[PDB]
Amino acid sequence: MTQFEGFTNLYQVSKTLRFELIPQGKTLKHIQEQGFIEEDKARNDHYKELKPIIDRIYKTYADQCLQLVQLDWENLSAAIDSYRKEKTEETRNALIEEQATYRNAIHDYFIGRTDNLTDAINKRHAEIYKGLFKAELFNGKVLKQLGTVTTTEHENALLRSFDKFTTYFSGFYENRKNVFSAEDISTAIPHRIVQDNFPKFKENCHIFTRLITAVPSLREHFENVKKAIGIFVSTSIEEVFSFPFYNQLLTQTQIDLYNQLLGGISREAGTEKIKGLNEVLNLAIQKNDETAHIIASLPHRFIPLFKQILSDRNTLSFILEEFKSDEEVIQSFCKYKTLLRNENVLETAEALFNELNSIDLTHIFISHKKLETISSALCDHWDTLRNALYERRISELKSAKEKVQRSLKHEDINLQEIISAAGKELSEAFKQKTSEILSHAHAALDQPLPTTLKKQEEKEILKSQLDSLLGLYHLLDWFAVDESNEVDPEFSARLTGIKLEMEPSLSFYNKARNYATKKPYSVEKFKLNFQMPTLASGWDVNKEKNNGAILFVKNGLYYLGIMPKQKGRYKALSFEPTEKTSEGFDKMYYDYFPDAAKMIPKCSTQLKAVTAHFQTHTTPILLSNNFIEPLEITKEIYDLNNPEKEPKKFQTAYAKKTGDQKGYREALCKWIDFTRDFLSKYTKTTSIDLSSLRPSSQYKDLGEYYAELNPLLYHISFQRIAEKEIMDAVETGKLYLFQIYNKDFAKGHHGKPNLHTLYWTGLFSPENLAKTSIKLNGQAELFYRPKSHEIIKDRRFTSDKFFFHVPITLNYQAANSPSKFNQRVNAYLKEHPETPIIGIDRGERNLIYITVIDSTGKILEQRSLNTIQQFDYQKKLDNREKERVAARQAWSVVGTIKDLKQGYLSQVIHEIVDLMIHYQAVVVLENLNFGFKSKRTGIAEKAVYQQFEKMLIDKLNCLVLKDYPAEKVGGVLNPYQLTDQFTSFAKMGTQSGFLFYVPAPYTSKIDPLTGFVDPFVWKTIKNHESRKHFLEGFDFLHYDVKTGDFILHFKMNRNLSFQRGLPGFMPAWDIVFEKNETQFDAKGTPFIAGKRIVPVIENHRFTGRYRDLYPANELIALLEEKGIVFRDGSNILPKLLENDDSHAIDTMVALIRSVLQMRNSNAATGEDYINSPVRDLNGVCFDSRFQNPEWPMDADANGAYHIALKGQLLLNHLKESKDLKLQNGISNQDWLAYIQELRN
């Protein structure tokens, strides 16, 4: 028997807290006199400007090392293909093994242990390889091994700035250490060139050979384009797509060349571009040949390879030089404008335009690749003047039309022919547009230019002027000025001259675009160091004179004290713990052993002395220093810790591979005895009690023992320290003291502290001191950021502040990582069938809506979350989005929307968890991958809502409640754990702890009462013939004289061409055209039954506005127009098909589509509602207007109800799932079968 409160203290989580530091007294002065702010800023400046120097060494050794790699890829390809053939598990582990094998073989070159190379170069590579991740870089020791990077003296002087400070790069050391590891990390060289680029190359090989065997004609094309691109000149175009050629393509340059081969070199602007492989293949597919139909039947795009890590860009395509400063761009543009003006380009341009009215118009030609732009700009469609010329050339005449379009679309056409086919209205539109363009250009030239562009309006005016400029250029480039056909010599000469005169605006335009779109600089914080190499790396009392960080607690307040190096050295400053009665500070005492698995072998078995001693002789060795008693080390123990093999005999890999569990158990028992002896005899840990441990042979796994052991090591005490001593240490300058501070520690606050502040209070709670649930962690940094009743707006940026970041770990007593968490959740839900369900849906009126249901599907509660603390957030969302797109072409700042995002989502989250703890339910969300929405719904931007899952996940990872008692479940010391750690959206299945994921569609459109939804697709019916075929596909239709409603009876296996193809649970349907009489709700307001809302599409191609409809009244008006008698209950179906005019058929189709339109909404009038045309088995026409709380209130409420029902189905299957597993989503047919089944 497990209970809901049992889901706590399951696994550790790690959080970071941020605080502002207030200096206390003279320490603010004394930090300035040492000037550590400027020194640290200079240090950090040296760091980021020296970082690109360092990785050049990494790049150089990577390129040198990889060029010797030579491997067969046949086995890896075979494994990949075999796993592709069928996705059984043992092939997956086979492919995993092959991937690890290839990764290790590639890493062998890096370590210098590869077999294929000789021993001298192997030892050379090893001698290099040990030097990358040490201080050998900074003194240039490894530079002697390379002699290739060849830094200048300024770089060497930069390297001299970090003498005796190499620990600053430890994080960078680890970051680059992830690179050269065969450990399947996504950010690693061998994982990239094994699992990322190589499958792409293999499939590119296979699609190439399929293209070759499909048609051999493009083999000539491919060799031709290789010769044109001039890349890989020493190999065949077949051989490059062969597996042995992947012995190249490891360095960046070959990757770049391959990508250029796929894409093609881009020349400078205004020039023809050399096409690539994908481009020529797309040109082949765009010819609409039967061969293209053969190609369209095949995959038809190569895939570029991923970029090699740490390298740079070395493309052959043209790179435009970028601008530097505002004054540069404005002076360049001012002088360009004055040059253009003094060149009098406008006057000769005007002379060029009016010349057209007094020239032989057939003697001037227009480029065939620009005429469609002119047709679009001067008519309602691009195809207007194209079809005009097409039908003119047709009119002056099967294959003849082909020759006409061939001669038309490719050849440049004289202007007189254009005028003859077009008409003088296009001439007047042309002269109007040219007048507008010349007016814009003249105004832009007359308009001066601002003194900078940091304001948006300056960017606007320059963008407008330069925009008019390249618009004029686009106007100028319309004319086919080439002399292949006739062209007027003086006119062409003046046109070419003026185009060359005003040419470089386009380059000016792109350079201005690149300069203005740069993100503006803002001031940043940087890490403080106080000349401490290891400032606050850890808190331990032994290291506290080296890490230099000491905490104090004073009557509720918190103080962090830093002592610096005095006269360039660590003066041993210490204090005396006085009585608790004495006034003063309470110093924290950090007694901590980091981890048994790393420290015990370090201080015990992997010392230099023991390794030397036991290499010489087999005699056991006694260790004395840092031990109260001489510690025995046996040969056997060293053999277990140093097995000359990957699996240690006490560790579980030995058990998994070997299988001899006896030796595994005995080695484990011996190891536990040894580490118990070590913990007994070691100086730091001899004072700790370990009586809570089980005896040695009872333990199951070593990791279990370690996870048991680690919480015993960590321990905090507190000692009162006299106040005047601390004051004297501060006044001497020997102690820098800050107060840890946030909003909540201010005196003017009352009630509801911030959650992080509540964590901080809970860390130092005496109960947490008794047993450690909240553990303070190491590696804390300090940041300095410079500067940037009536209250001052933006007060917190006015002056410089000292920031403080500190990591803490929650649920310390729990295990390191969760295991079988979903299994535990499924077990609890199996034991509790009575658990409620909460459904979430994204509405159109509401941003989000919630529904609470039981196991019986009864609505406990629905509620609007559209407004929280009486605010409409969708309004601000749409204003911010419209300013985003308005600033997009405006060359403005990009900005962010995500603060308003998470501000609304936080209140949503808080309401969600309040409901969750109140109801002890589960929560169902829609799968983000299996759906699509747009602006018709409120919040539904896919990027917006997908991110909303994330804070839900980690808030449910370590959920606490601010008003709970700290010792209670849901308090600080017992956080609720309900989910697992989020990794990636594509990673988790349908279940994440108590959360559940279901397919989005077929949720809102269904009637809740019986499970009816329209099965008919309506884009099928385009003509009255299809509409007639649709209306004949019906069973029986008659009018109820008693109820005054029109009754349609429908069966499956009819209109299957118009169905959506998903069968329902029952084959019978009885649609009722409800009479549009008045009806009343639960409250008493009248409403019209069957009322529908419909957009306007009367113009047959566009969408209008919304309007009302009364289908029964319009229906009876239609039959009175047709004069067909229907007050008899007779079959109206033969009577309707008698009148075969397309208008009548279209009207009845529209009416029955409208009554099949389940969703009814118009926010302009404010009516969002659901009316079911299909009546109940009780005969009740369902409406959401009835306001029954038993049924959903609104349409989005209906969707939330239905997604809750989907979750109910999924967990009911879990109840039937005896394997404790879950389905891979929910099939739509299964869903509608289920909902129709229990509804009917």
Q: Which of residues 102-141 bind RNA (CB under 7 A)?
A: none
1097 touches DNA (CB under 7 A)? no
Provide, rounded to whole angstroms, the least separation between the CB of residue 905 and RNA: 8
* Stretch of 776-784, 831-839, 1020-1028, 1130-1138 lying at the interface with DNA (CB under 7 A): 776-784
Candidates 130, 602, 743, 1051; binder of RNA (CB under 7 A) is 743
569 phi-psi bin (left φ>0, alpha ψ -120 to 50, beta other): beta
Tell me: is residue 50 an annotated ligand-binding position: yes
Residues whose CB is less than 8 angstroms from the CB of residue 971 and which lie 6 or more positions away in sequence, other chains included: 960, 961, 964, 965
**CB of 1057 within 8 A of CB of 1228?**
no
- Selection from DNA, RNA, none that 363 binds (CB < 5 to 8 A by kind) is none
Tell me: is residue 749 an annotated ligand-binding position: yes
**CB of 588 within 8 A of CB of 721?**
no
866 touches DNA (CB under 7 A)? no
Q: What is the DSSP string of 1065-1110?
A: S-SEEEEEE----EEE-SS--EEETT-EEEE--TTSSS---EEEE-
Query: In terms of CB distance, is 25 or 171 closer to DNA?
Result: 171
Provide, rounded to whole angstroms, the least separation between the CB of residue 521 and DNA: 10
Number of CB atoms found within 10 A of residue 99's CB: 20
Binding mask 288-307 for RNA (x = CB under 7 A): x-----------------xx
Q: Which two tokens stand for residue 255?
A: 């990757």
904 touches RNA (CB under 7 A)? yes
Query: In terms of CB distance, is 818 or 839 closer to DNA?
Result: 818
Q: Which two tokens stand for residue 713?
A: 């090591």
Q: Which two tokens stand for residue 731?
A: 């006044």
Candidates 39, 55, 279, 503; binder of DNA (CB under 7 A) is 279
Rg (CA), the chain: 39
Query: In terms of CB distance, is 982 or 1002 closer to RNA?
Result: 982
DSSP 135: G
396 touches RNA (CB under 7 A)? no
CA geometry: angle 1050, 1201, 1194, nearest 5 deg: 80
* Stretch of 33-41, 360-368, 511-519, 789-797 lying at the interface with DNA (CB under 7 A): 511-519
Tell me: is residue 307 an annotated ligand-binding position: yes
Residues in a beta bridge with 13? 810
Annotated catalytic residue 540: no
Tell me: is residue 48 an annotated ligand-binding position: yes
3-class state of residue 444 by DSSP: helix
Residues whose CB is less than 8 angstroms from the CB of residue 134 and which lie 6 or more positions away in sequence, other chains included: none
Candidates 707, 716, 726, 1232; binder of DNA (CB under 7 A) is 707
66 touches RNA (CB under 7 A)? no
Report the alpha-carbon distance of residue 1065 to residue 1230 in Å, rounded. 9
- Within residues 580-599, the interface with DNA by CB under 7 A covers 590, 592-595, 597-599
Query: In terms of CB distance, is 703 or 857 closer to DNA?
Result: 703
- Within residues 874-903, the interface with RNA by CB under 7 A covers 876, 888-889, 899-900, 902-903
How many residues make contact with RNA (CB under 7 A)? 92
Phi, psi (degrees; rounded to nearest 5) at 1008? -65, -25
Candidates 298, 523, 886, 894; binder of DNA (CB under 7 A) is 894
Candidates 233, 792, 986, 1164; binder of RNA (CB under 7 A) is 792
884: exposed, middle or buried (Cβ count in 10 Å: 0-12, 13-18, 19+): middle
Tell me: is residue 335 an annotated ligand-binding position: no
Provide, rounded to whole angstroms, the least separation between the CB of residue 701 and DNA: 5
Tell me: is residue 442 an annotated ligand-binding position: no
Annotated catalytic residue 841: yes
Annotated catalytic residue 160: no
Residues in a beta bridge with 414? 365
* Stretch of 442-450, 564-572, 1006-1014, 1026-1034 lying at the interface with DNA (CB under 7 A): 564-572
Report the alpha-carbon distance of residue 538 to residue 780 in Å, rounded. 7
Indicate which residue of 398, 424, 519, 793 is catalytic.
Answer: 793
* Stretch of 210-218, 801-809, 1177-1185, 1201-1209 lying at the interface with RNA (CB under 7 A): 801-809
- Within residues 951-990, the interface with RNA by CB under 7 A covers 951, 954-955, 962
Q: What is the DSSP string of 899-929?
A: HHHHHHHHHHHHHHHHHHHHHT-EEEEE-ST
Residue with tokens 């507190």: 718
Query: In terms of CB distance, is 955 or 1239 closer to RNA?
Result: 955
Q: Which two tokens stand for residue 45?
A: 């400046």
- Selection from DNA, RNA, none that 599 binds (CB < 5 to 8 A by kind) is DNA
Indicate which residue of 98, 108, 458, 841 is catalytic.
Answer: 841
Tell me: is residue 751 an annotated ligand-binding position: yes
Candidates 207, 310, 340, 607; binder of DNA (CB under 7 A) is 607
Indicate which residue of 463, 1196, 1206, 1239 is catalytic.
Answer: 1196
3-class state of residue 1171 by DSSP: strand
603 touches DNA (CB under 7 A)? yes
886 touches DNA (CB under 7 A)? no
702 touches DNA (CB under 7 A)? yes
Q: How many angstroms separate the Cα of 814 from the Cα of each of 242, 436, 518, 714, 1035?
A: 53, 74, 48, 14, 66
- Within residues 448-477, the interface with RNA by CB under 7 A covers 470, 474
Report the alpha-carbon distance of residue 446 to residue 428 in Å, rounded. 26
Give the residue among 468, 427, 463 at the shortest CA–CA distance from 445.
468
Provide, rounded to whole angstroms, the least separation between the CB of residue 388 and RNA: 15
Number of CB atoms found within 10 A of residue 878's CB: 12
Residue with tokens 């995500």: 898
Report the alpha-carbon distance of residue 605 to residue 641 in Å, rounded. 7
- Selection from DNA, RNA, none that 315 binds (CB < 5 to 8 A by kind) is DNA
Tell me: is residue 39 an annotated ligand-binding position: no
- Selection from RNA, DNA, none that 423 binds (CB < 5 to 8 A by kind) is none
Candidates 909, 917, 1089, 1119; binder of RNA (CB under 7 A) is 909
Discontinuities in the chain with C to N beyond 2.5 Å fall right after 397, 788
Candidates 29, 51, 898, 1107; binder of DNA (CB under 7 A) is 898
Q: How many angstroms separate the Cα of 27 from the Cα of each of 24, 552, 738, 1134?
A: 6, 16, 8, 98
Number of CB atoms found within 10 A of residue 168's CB: 18
Provide, rounded to whole angstroms, the least separation between the CB of residue 710 and RNA: 17
Residues in a beta bridge with 1181? 1175
Query: In terms of CB distance, is 650 or 1126 closer to DNA?
Result: 650
266 touches DNA (CB under 7 A)? yes
626 touches DNA (CB under 7 A)? yes
**CB of 914 within 8 A of CB of 957?**
no
381 touches DNA (CB under 7 A)? yes
Query: In terms of CB distance, is 500 or 572 closer to DNA?
Result: 572
Helices and strands in the chain, H and E counts: 43, 31
Q: How far apart are the first and last CA of the chain?
A: 36
Provide, rounded to whole angstroms, the least separation between the CB of residue 372 and RNA: 5
Residues whose CB is less than 8 angstroms from the CB of residue 451 and which lie 6 or more positions away in sequence, other chains included: 330
The distance from CA 1048 to its chain's CA centroid, rounded to whole angstroms, is: 49
Indicate which residue of 499, 545, 670, 1159 is catalytic.
Answer: 1159
Indicate which residue of 40, 412, 844, 926 is catalytic.
Answer: 926
Annotated catalytic residue 328: no
Candidates 64, 259, 578, 1020; binder of DNA (CB under 7 A) is 259
3-class state of residue 716 by DSSP: strand
304 touches DNA (CB under 7 A)? yes
- Within residues 534-563, the interface with DNA by CB under 7 A covers 534, 537-540, 542-543, 546-547
Annotated catalytic residue 793: yes
Residue with tokens 């002088």: 335
Residue ranges at the known binding site: 47-51, 175-176, 307-310, 747-756
Residue ranges at the known binding site for crRNA: 47-51, 175-176, 307-310, 747-756
Catalytic residue numbers read: 793, 841, 926, 1159, 1196
